[PDB]
């Protein structure tokens, strides 16, 4: 065949830390369908927002928003435990159906997005050009986000170990752990990946007695 219908830009959702995670790649032939399981970013989360994005940038905010919806009634559970199946399906007429379903509770929500939505030919070409012109910056942002998400979880896991250990943790040690938690917290707000990893290292270096308990 010398012609066919494709979806012209990647399609996906926003995931933890402000990144676009792709479910259908640019230039995929239509009709097509893809599903992927996701989970919750923090402990006890009862809801997620599925923000539907079109484009090639790694920052969710730099992509075209096609719509959004919430899924709620998830039983509050530890981060990473809920199994939320997200499905993008584009039919032969370019209509995009997105659904999210929480496996445990069975709760599901969906939206339908018309084929005329999204970026036009000029904006499609500008998106591919802008993505390439910013390829290194976007790679650096993705790595930063990965590191931030790891430190964010190290803040939460460490703090709970402090709780559980209670009196079994020497006051000297709680002191040093507390200050390193605050320094990690501050670093996570910045954009320097090595600074964050360094505060993670400093925190490990005062958590050894906590490690053993």
């Amino acid at each position: 065949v010398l012609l066919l219908d494709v979806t012209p830009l990647s399609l996906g959702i926003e995931t933890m830390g402000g990144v676009m995670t792709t479910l259908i790649a640019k230039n995929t032939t239509i009709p097509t369908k893809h599903s992927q399981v996701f989970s919750t970013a923090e402990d006890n989360q009862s809801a997620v927002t599925i923000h539907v994005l079109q484009g090639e940038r790694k920052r969710a905010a730099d992509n075209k928003s096609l719509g959004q919806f919430n899924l709620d009634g998830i039983n509050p559970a530890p981060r990473g435990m809920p199994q939320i199946e997200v499905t993008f399906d584009i039919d032969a007429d370019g209509i995009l159906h997105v659904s999210a379903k929480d496996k445990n509770s069975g709760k599901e929500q969906k939206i339908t997005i018309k084929a005329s939505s999204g970026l036009n030919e000029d904006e499609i070409q500008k998106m591919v050009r802008d993505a390439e012109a910013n390829a290194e910056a976007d790679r650096k942002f993705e790595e930063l986000v990965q590191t931030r998400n790891q430190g964010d979880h190290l803040l939460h896991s460490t703090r709970k170990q402090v709780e559980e250990a209670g009196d079994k943790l020497p006051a000297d040690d709680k002191t040093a752990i507390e200050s390193a938690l605050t320094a990690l917290e501050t670093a996570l707000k910045g954009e320097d990946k090595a600074a964050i990893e360094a505060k993670m290292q400093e925190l490990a270096q005062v958590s050894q007695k906590l490690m053993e308990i």
């Binding site: 989970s39 923090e42 809801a47 997620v48 709620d72």
Partner: peptide
Amino acid sequence: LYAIPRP
């Protein structure tokens, strides 16, 4: 496995 934030 990616994670989705709350609304």
